[PDB]
Amino acid sequence: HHHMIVLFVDFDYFYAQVEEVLNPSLKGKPVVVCVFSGRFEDSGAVATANYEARKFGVKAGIPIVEAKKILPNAVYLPMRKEVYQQVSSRIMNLLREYSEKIEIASIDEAYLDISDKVRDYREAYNLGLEIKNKILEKEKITVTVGISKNKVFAKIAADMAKPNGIKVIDDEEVKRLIRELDIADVPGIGNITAEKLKKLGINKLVDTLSIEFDKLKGMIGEAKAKYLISLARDEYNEPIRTRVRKSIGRIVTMKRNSRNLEEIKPYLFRAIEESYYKLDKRIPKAIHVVAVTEDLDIVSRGRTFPHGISKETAYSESVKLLQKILEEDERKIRRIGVRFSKFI
DNA sequence: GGGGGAAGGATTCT
DNA sequence: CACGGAATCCTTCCCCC
Ligand SMILES: Nc1nc2c(ncn2[C@H]2C[C@H](O)[C@@H](COP(=O)(O)OP(=O)(O)OP(=O)(O)O)O2)c(=O)[nH]1
Ligand SMILES: [Ca+2]
Ligand SMILES: [Ca+2]
Ligand SMILES: [Ca+2]
């Protein structure tokens, strides 16, 4: 309004909390949601865990085996994505009743442009307690709210107040963070980028202002360059806009690695059958076969057709692209799947 | 010189 | 890496005005 007022909501340890909601008997105990790859007994990884377990180091990304090694007595539940998704949607609807300007950024977070629903942050903070309280009431889900002048800082405000919290980073505090904040804690800055920036001499957002663009561009790319410089100059003002799915796909892990076409197909087709059920009523013009090689490397191959793709065409083309992969790469394949995009 | 795609890879999401 | 999506961006290549 004078400048945006963004309200960001991020659901606390989502998948695990949902499981808690569906079985409150779990509350207070360490809960670990798992992704069993079927390779052996407990092969796989943790999708997420609640804070009770997270304090002992059990968090998203670690092998289930190491999790059990740390907390052999925690409750281990298999991931139930669809259920979580439906719980997510109902909540997104609640939020949708606090602003038409809503951006569902992921399965458990969203930005709300509340510039014309409040003036000054006090009214914002209160509107956050209002929303937090509302959600807790209707779905018994705790969330963390973040408020600031733009999407990035609202999210940062959230990361700082997790879990079940709420924080406001006023315009004056942004100035402090632009200099105080660790560059790696900036959204979109993963380990790889974090490093490329270290070497360059950037450790705080402020530092991107003292380097020459062209150099910074060649090191982390133009897009990421302008992004950081925007935040640095305190000129980041990306608008909140409704995002719509552009891709739908599934990829499974094989019992054993392989390069034998007939051994891989059953998995590939299974991925297709599920990808299709999920496409719902959407018709894709583009298809990509995706394979994870034995050394966790990802190779893909695809084709865009001038028309929509039928299930039959998907089966036939997928086999061709899979062959193109086996043909152009010697590695064994560990995970195989498909991705459909460019919906009509 | 440069628009517009398409394809395959790189990163991020914490 | 010991899942499993999904978005965006980079580089290269291609057709061609
Ligand atoms: N399979 C899989 N799922 C993930 C992964 N990371 C996150 N998810 C899923 C399950 C998480 O509960 C859900 C929400 O992501 P968040 O980063 O907000 O994690 P959580 O919500 O557990 O984090 P938080 O409470 O905000 O610290 O997305 C991952 O690495 N693998
Ligand atoms: Ca989140
Ligand atoms: Ca969360
Ligand atoms: Ca990071």
CA of residue A249 to ligand 1 center, whole Å: 19
Give, using CA atoms, the residue closest to atom 5 of ligand 1: A47
Please list the residues that pair with A339 across neighbouring strands. A249, A288
Q: Is residue A344 situated within a structural domain? A: no
Residue A196 CA to residue A107 CA, distance in Å, equals: 30
Q: Is residue A63 situated within a structural domain? A: yes
Residue A78 CA to residue A33 CA, distance in Å, equals: 6
Strand B–CB A24 distance below 7 A? no
Distance A20 CA to B10 C1' (A): 37
What residues make up the domain containing A158? 5-13+81-169
Please report where in the chains the tokens 């995002």 appear, as a residue: A243
Residue A258 CA to residue A71 CA, distance in Å, equals: 33
> Within this chain, do residues A125 and A57 fall inside the same structural domain, yes or no?
no
Give, using CA atoms, the residue closest to atom 23 of ligand 1: A13
Domain stops at, among A210, A236, A262:
A236
CA of residue A132 to ligand 3 center, whole Å: 13
Distance A224 CA to C12 C1' (A): 20
Which CATH number fits the domain that encloses residue A9? 3.30.70.270
Q: Regarding beta strands A284-293 and A298-304, do their DSSP bridges make them parallel or antiparallel, or are they unpaired?
A: antiparallel
State the burial class of residue A88 (Cβ atoms within 10 Å of its Cβ: 0-12, 13-18, 19+): buried
* Ligand 1 binding pocket mutation candidate from A14, A36, A164 (most atoms within 8 A of CB): A14
The type of residue at A162 is K
Q: Count other C-beta atoms under 10 Å from residue A11's C-beta.
A: 25
> Within this chain, do residues A229 and A215 fall inside the same structural domain, yes or no?
yes
CA distances from A136 to A56, A91, A196, A338 (A): 26, 10, 41, 37
CA distances from A195 to A134, A190, A200, A286 (A): 41, 9, 9, 34
> Within this chain, do residues A27 and A163 fall inside the same structural domain, yes or no?
no
State the burial class of residue A223 (Cβ atoms within 10 Å of its Cβ: 0-12, 13-18, 19+): exposed
Q: Is residue A157 situated within a structural domain? A: yes
Q: Which residue is nearest to nucleotide C4 (CA to C1')?
A: A251
At A191, list the tokens: 């380990």
> Within this chain, do residues A95 and A118 fall inside the same structural domain, yes or no?
yes
Q: Count other C-beta atoms under 10 Å from residue A122's C-beta.
A: 10
Which CATH number fits the domain that encloses residue A212? 1.10.150.20
What is the dihedral sign for C-alpha A280, A285, A286, A287? positive
Q: A73 — phi, psi (to 5°)? A: -105, 5
Q: Count other C-beta atoms under 10 Å from residue A54's C-beta.
A: 19
Q: Is residue A242 situated within a structural domain? A: no
Sheet with strand A298-304: strands edge to edge: A247-258, A333-343, A284-293, A298-304
Q: Is A12 annotated as a binding residue?
A: no
Domain stops at, among A29, A56, A80:
A80
Those residues whose C-beta lies under 8 Å from the C-beta of residue A341, and which sit 6 or more positions away, are: A246, A247, A248, A284, A285, A286, A287, A288
CA of residue A74 to ligand 1 center, whole Å: 18
Residue A197 CA to residue A221 CA, distance in Å, equals: 11
> Within this chain, do residues A105 and A141 fall inside the same structural domain, yes or no?
yes
> Within this chain, do residues A180 and A57 fall inside the same structural domain, yes or no?
no
Distance A303 CA to C17 C1' (A): 26
CA distances from A308 to A275, A286, A305, A338 (A): 15, 8, 7, 16
Contact A288, A304 (CB under 8 A): no
> Within this chain, do residues A26 and A41 fall inside the same structural domain, yes or no?
yes
Strand B–CB A187 distance below 7 A? yes
Strand C–CB A284 distance below 7 A? no
Please list the residues that pair with A336 across neighbouring strands. A252, A291
Residue A40 CA to residue A188 CA, distance in Å, equals: 34
- Taking CA A116 as the corner, what is the angle to CA A115 and CA A118, rounded to the nearest 5 degrees? 75
Closest ligand relative to A162 C-alpha: 1
Nearest CA to A124 out of A235, A236, A9, A241 is that of A9
* Bases of chain C within 7 A of a CB of the protein: 1-11
Residue A153 CA to residue A147 CA, distance in Å, equals: 7
Pick the catalytic residue from A109, A222, A263, A317.
Answer: A109
At A234, list the tokens: 């305190």
Annotation marks residue A109 as catalytic: yes
Experimental approach was: X-ray
> Within this chain, do residues A149 and A273 fall inside the same structural domain, yes or no?
no
Contact A246, A283 (CB under 8 A): no
Q: Is residue A104 situated within a structural domain? A: yes
Q: Is the CB of A107 under 6 A from ligand 1?
A: yes
Q: Regarding beta strands A143-148 and A166-168, do their DSSP bridges make them parallel or antiparallel, or are they unpaired?
A: parallel
Domain stops at, among A58, A80, A102:
A80
Q: Is residue A241 situated within a structural domain? A: no
> Within this chain, do residues A61 and A76 fall inside the same structural domain, yes or no?
yes
| Helix (H), strand (E), coil (C) string for chain A | CCCCCEEEEEECCHHHHHHHHCCHHHCCCCEEEEEECCCCCCCEEEEEECHHHHCCCCCCCCEHHHHHHHCCCCEEEECCHHHHHHHHHHHHHHHCCCCCCEEEEECCEEEEECCCCCCHHHHHHHHHHHHHHHHHHHHCCCEEEEEECCHHHHHHHHHHHCCCCEEECCHHHHHHHHHHCEHHHCCCCCHHHHHHHHHHCCCEHHHHHHCCHHHHHHHHCHHHHHHHHHHHCCCCCCCCCCCCCCEEEEEEEEEEEECCHHHHHHHHHHHHHHHHHHHCCCCEEEEEEEEEECCCCEEEEEEECCCCCCHHHHHHHHHHHHHHHHHHCCCCEEEEEEEEEEEC
Which CATH number fits the domain that encloses residue A304? 3.30.1490.100
Which CATH number fits the domain that encloses residue A19? 3.40.1170.60
Q: Is A170 annotated as a binding residue?
A: no
Q: A144 — phi, psi (to 5°)? A: -120, 130
Residue A176 CA to residue A170 CA, distance in Å, equals: 10
What is the dihedral sign for C-alpha A241, A235, A127, A86? positive
Contact A302, A289 (CB under 8 A): yes
At A43, list the tokens: 């092969």
CA of residue A274 to ligand 1 center, whole Å: 23
> Within this chain, do residues A269 and A295 fall inside the same structural domain, yes or no?
yes
This PDB structure is determined at a resolution in Å of 2.5
Nearest CA to A202 out of A184, A226, A222, A224 is that of A184
> Within this chain, do residues A60 and A159 fall inside the same structural domain, yes or no?
no
In chain A, how many domains are there?
4
> Within this chain, do residues A263 and A333 fall inside the same structural domain, yes or no?
yes
Q: Is the CB of A299 under 6 A from ligand 1?
A: no
